[model samples]
Target chain A: QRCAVAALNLEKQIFQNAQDKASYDQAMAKKNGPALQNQVITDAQRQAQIQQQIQLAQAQQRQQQQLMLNRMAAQGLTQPPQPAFQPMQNPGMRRVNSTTENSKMQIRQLMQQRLTPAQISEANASGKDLVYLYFQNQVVQVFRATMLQAQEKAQQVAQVQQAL
Target chain B: LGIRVRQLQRLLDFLEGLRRVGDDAVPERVTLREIVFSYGWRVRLDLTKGVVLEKGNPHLRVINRLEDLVNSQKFYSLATYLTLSLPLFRAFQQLENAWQTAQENGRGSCFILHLSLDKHTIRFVLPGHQRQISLLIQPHEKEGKLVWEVGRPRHDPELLNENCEFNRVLKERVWTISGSGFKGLVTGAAAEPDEGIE
Candidate 1:
């Protein structure tokens, strides 16, 4: 009877340990799982939001230009000087340029098995032009939203890493 | 909505691929220890396969322990481990089931169960059954594995059936099981009639 009782007691302790471990795991998951999910959702939402913002800005610019043309026509100026489409520059443009330049240099180095100063300069120039065209206000807004979402995702990933 | 759904689907596919690669990297044969429970019952479980090599008294205490671990806040808690481990468990379960069926029916049997971690979908093939069960792991999105308490439910008999009836029933019931990988157990049934035993 004593052995049986002892066995039962030992079993109980093991059971409890397992249970405790399970509970601890569950609670941790509860705390962090949703946060990770929310972060992903937030990222998707942010992207959509920035896209909307860009659309809004583009619409506004088009409307303003149209209004100016109408006024000029009313004043008997046959044609409004073709609106010089000088690209509006932003801080993000530089980052985009640098990223593209780096990627191009890497690609070139891999393809040619060598990297020269001339190639680097050529890559940089092309990258800058590409970034100037690609990094519009709308694009930057979308990129910023995506980056913020990525940061949140990184935090959630860190939690999983710790759990593992 | 379309884009978001597609993106999520792609991510799930990517994760599944990574899991397959990880599982393939593990050593094929692994030695495991025995798990003793209350009531003087014991079972030798293959940790790599997660199968009960021997049956013991329903380990209610052990079940509870697993539950606790699952519910715990620790880093290696049951829930986290299951997210990473359950696919392998399901794979072993299906393999064992196929082995059992072949042993009883004296006929060769091949069964396949496909599960999705994102949706907790369980799909399995019994001998002649063409359908599958689709149970949902609800209330927690990250918790995608099914765990039955040791004492709460015995082995699912329908799952052990030779015909694929179990698969059809599960599909009808809409219970989801999640995991990936494949395992098989060949029995005497798979041997040719002319083959002699040593």
Candidate 2:
């Protein structure tokens, strides 16, 4: 009977302690819950304010850029005239004036080469067919010449240089 | 209107001129007229030979041409206008890079870049089914009427049953250029502002 009573007493103490803990926990929750919620709400409000400010900032930036572009429309750009150009300046220039023309009457022969189909065709066929070589060579010449002209003009223009 | 055209033209001239220096070889004062007309000749040559006949690569041609179109629009929201240039250039770079890789990888003739001009927008059409992916260029406006913007939208065309070959090539080789390029340029920040190809 003494052992049974002792065991029962121990079980009752365990239950009392558990009940005390539960009640204390409930009281603490009631006391702290409102303040904790208020803090959370305040933090969220601050975050939302930051987010709204960022949106406005982005929107304002976009507006400024647009207005600047509108101003760009009024600004006029003038096309500078193409300067009087020099002949080809690269290795090909020397090659054409040298190898294609003999020292004797070499200078004048360029025109002959240009005028005579047979002269062009003869040099042309040395590599491939006369037509293919002639077409390729002439086309290359025109493209290179025009491209060089544009380059010189571009360098001369201050506006072009700035943009580049 | 003429001034706008001339300004655009001058920009192209300078761009091509700079390109010439960079290339250290041959390059276009290629006017819009020149590009449009040249495409006709290219079409004839391709149909006759059943292959890309032009000796020079079409990469720069396609790029410069679009660049011209992009810079010509006036009153566009600065971001959209600025967004388009670098992306267009990036696409050019991407295509050239792809060209180099394709050559190195033993892939013969990866693909050709082609564009067809419609009433309002210029659409990029690939060779096969050609209609699956389109890069459309048209003028866009904002609701407030404060500024104009270039409406560049990428979407699928009318569907076809054939496999979307070009779309696959673009995805694998060249990404959705303007879309990604815009993200890159816009996210980082900067603003900006063409030619024909053979």
Candidate 3:
């Protein structure tokens, strides 16, 4: 179970529910999924991958141009000024605010405080009600203790008075 | 979790009940029959079905704003509020006293409850809060006004600190519950262990 806040302290970290966490994960993936996915072995392989991508783009452009040319030729005219190719959108560069998303999402401090195993097992085994007549016990205990102390003091004073 | 919350409400009510009764109404110890029957119609349930105040779960340690904590985590019902029964906020008041003392000292606020398995003890440190007090009295003098001898090393805050410290030490002894209404201590869980073991 999650508390909305990390630790109950002056400097508390707010904890997010599951739905908020999932959206946060999705936002991060959408922001960096491409560059992260393309990670490769060897500098050569990396360069080759880049080179391979460039060639594919060029081929797609070439095919598009050819189709354009065909359309122009069929129209009985030469190609006009130019043909613009649809640019592939970069998911990573999309204007994802590492800022606004932060307001909905937040960090939670890890719970560091915990009761130990031995005390618990024993306390459970002990089966004593630690809170039953709490203050009743408190008042009488102090009352008894105070009276005892008074009695002891009386004895010491009586002995001294008797000596005098 | 629901039961845990309900239990807190009940115990919170118990604290308020203690308040309204004053010294005259409340007996030093309550009989299960007295509290149960006097408070409600259910004669059998309140006495026979005692509560289990568990110490095993980690969440009993949590203190937070209700909205701020994670409800899905079963945190409140899981840990300390996790009731593992009925503590009259004894530990809470003690820790609050320590915090108040620290703030008064300009030492910053600190509240931490550490449980040691080996010692079979729970140590609550409120920063510089040690159970300390001093009192001296007239022994021989009988009838006449005996001269009082009592001085605080540091007045005000320290006196409050001393009282809270007394409560702190006294808490364990006074902090007992006789679920049987017999006014005696007993053992083994009056309830169960964990929701994890749930």
What is residue B28's positional error in candidate 2, in angstroms? 26
Q: For residues B83-135, what per-residue lDDT tens digits would candidate 2 score against the true structure?
A: 23434444434443433422222122222122222112212222234232323
TM-score of chain B of 2: 0.27
Greater DockQ among 1 and 3 belongs to 1
lDDT for each candidate structure: 0.30, 0.30, 0.26
Model 2 score (lDDT): 0.30
Per-prediction DockQ, in order? 0.02, 0.01, 0.01
Interface RMSD of 3: 34.6
Candidate 3 C-alpha error for residue A93, in Å? 33
- Per-residue lDDT for A1-164 in model 3, tens only? 11222112101111111112222122122225444342332233334223423433433342223333333332222211100111111111211222332222222101111335345454342243232223222322332232222222222223233445
Which portions of model 3 show Cα errors greater than 4 Å? Answer: A1-12, A16-164, B1-84, B88-90, B107-109, B113-198
- Model 1 ranges with Cα > 4 A deviation: A1-164, B1-95, B98-171, B174-198
Q: For residues A19-120, what per-residue lDDT tens digits would candidate 2 score against the true structure? A: 211211111121355545744554543343234334334433432223323332333221211111211111112223212222222233344446565554
Q: Which tens-of-lDDT digit does each residue in B94-132 have in candidate 1?
A: 443434433233232222211122222222223234333
Task: Give lDDT tens digits, candidate 3, residues B1-198.
Answer: 686777556545445544443323333332131222122211111311324221111222222222213431233322222221223223433434433423323233222211111011112222244332321111123354322221221122444443444333323122223132122111111111110122
Candidate 2 chain B: 10-residue stretch with minimal lDDT: B189-198
